Subunit: 242 residues, 3 copies
């Protein structure tokens, strides 16, 4: 009744995005039929990868493959108990968020050196966040990993709001880039907040069902809506892009 409820929250939060990522893929494929070869097409290709990885991630979680139990260390609000960790989320982020950055990079026509550094920071962010969730020896080390993950996040964010914006300005896409960059910054910021507030961090919210739904809602925006906005603009501005 709390377990019926917690289990009902968890499964619905996962099955919803299997459906939505599935539909996004179908929609995005259809939209690509009318998109002309060249830069518009390259962006579409990168963009389509985003829900492809996302739906994989959610099947990872649903199947039990990428979900485990983790013993919280002394000092944690749930010290001495096992908590369900959806570590599959952090893992697949390391592949899906570089696809987001690649679509943006193509859109803003960034320097390849900047692209490689950003994607590398992004992967560091994801792996250290995973380390934070997986660490059981001490509460200190969990939050130390969280802080390093934040430092990686700052590298990515800084690049977006400076060099990538600059690149977009001279590539003639600064207006759509700024929309998407603002969307990206706001929504990505939600993930470390969920982590911190949720059961793996401070556990202000102790329901893993609630924290799971929080990530799932963020994904709807940071992936599927982000991508739909991108593809709509590209399909309407193919010459600006080429």
């Amino acid at each position: 009744a709390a377990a019926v409820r917690e289990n009902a929250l968890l499964s619905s939060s996962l099955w919803v995005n299997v459906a939505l990522a599935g539909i996004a893929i179908l929609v995005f494929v259809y939209m690509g039929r009318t998109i002309r070869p060249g830069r518009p097409r390259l962006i579409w290709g990168a963009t389509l990868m985003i829900p492809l990885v996302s739906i994989s991630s959610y099947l990872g979680l649903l199947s039990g493959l990428t979900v485990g139990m983790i013993e919280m260390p002394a000092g944690h609000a749930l010290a001495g108990e096992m908590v369900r960790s959806q570590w599959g989320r952090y893992l697949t982020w390391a592949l899906s968020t570089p696809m987001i950055l690649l679509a943006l990079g193509l859109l803003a026509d960034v320097d390849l050196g900047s692209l490689f550094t950003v994607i590398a920071a992004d992967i560091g962010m994801c792996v250290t966040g995973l380390a934070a969730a997986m660490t059981t020896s001490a509460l200190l080390f969990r939050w130390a990993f969280y802080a390093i993950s934040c430092a990686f996040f700052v590298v990515v964010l800084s690049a977006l709001v400076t060099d990538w914006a600059a690149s977009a300005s001279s590539a003639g896409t600064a207006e759509i880039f700024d929309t998407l960059r603002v969307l990206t910054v706001v929504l990505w910021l939600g993930y470390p907040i969920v982590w911190a507030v949720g059961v793996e961090g401070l556990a202000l919210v102790q329901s893993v069902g609630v924290t799971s739904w929080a990530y799932s809602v963020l994904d709807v925006f940071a992936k599927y809506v982000f991508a739909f906005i991108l593809l709509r603009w590209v399909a309407n501005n193919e010459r600006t892009v080429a």
Copy 2:
């Protein structure tokens, strides 16, 4: 006598490609002495990586490091039993098949945006195939991962037969690209067929020794012969390439 036989199939299927990848490396190194710096040399470098990763993979399997037992879920032809899974194959594919795609990409002088999307799809293909083999909770999830892996495969294939062919046409290598692309498409198609027919899928063939040999034969062609054909052509057409 079935176990003597199954064990004889397994070890021979693995030791043969330690030998063949070993020899391929030796041959390819020798061939590189006569290849001129620049684009020909870059292709040679990428090409040489292919059997380097391959021989690593086979030592992974031989040593027991990347082989495990997996319990088949209800509904599977071998439901309730443990089957030997050569999961090391899927793992190293995620590094060796991007090397194949990189050699082709250099040959066809493709757009870097296309290259990054293709290699990302390729990695998604490999990791979801690995997920399919590793999933034990339900038969549904195994085949769902298989279907996503196929979708990633289609992304890669589509890029080959369209944009990469286009790139090869304007880079003056469309004739050798078309040979290699056709080789690649036909042989790569064999892997999901082996998976499906073999013990991890439908188990029409229940011998892991037989399924292992099937992958090993595919590797001989998709890697070592593919690469030897590439290097022969490059060493004979260095100016067309430069």
Copy 3:
């Protein structure tokens, strides 16, 4: 008293580089304030990643997350015993050493095809070294993985001393590249020597505390000093770089 000592060696060898990587990051960030957008800035960005990954690695080891016990196989000097393996080092090398190569690649303005092949070889080097440490079935397979790792290392080294030097010559950075390339070759050579001499290889040195310190000292030079030299030169030669 040997355990007090071995444990004192181990923890000090790990905490020292948490401190030093931490300080390097702080120093490098400060130095970046005075570095002009463009190629100098791109190098700085790539360079800053190096201690970011390094400090992550050391927290991985300190927390117990990426340290495990491994049973040495028959024939090993410590056959039948469990030895502490800092496998987290090999793992994070697969992300930090591509950042070193990326900073150099930007500095020498190398061909992207060369860059991708080198970074791929570099990752192969790291993963097969990890395989070597993780392999328990036979002593033969441990050293076979070590030899393949060496072959990957040779690919990387060959590229540095030939094509990358060539690129640096025509990009006008051959003098600073040659310093850094020589630094890189000498210090990187120290790692397989430590492996071989230390407890995981021949165990001429059986103290894991001593072997850990050896890696930690190599890191100080191959990462933090390497990077400080790079940033000093870039900040003093911004026009040569642009």
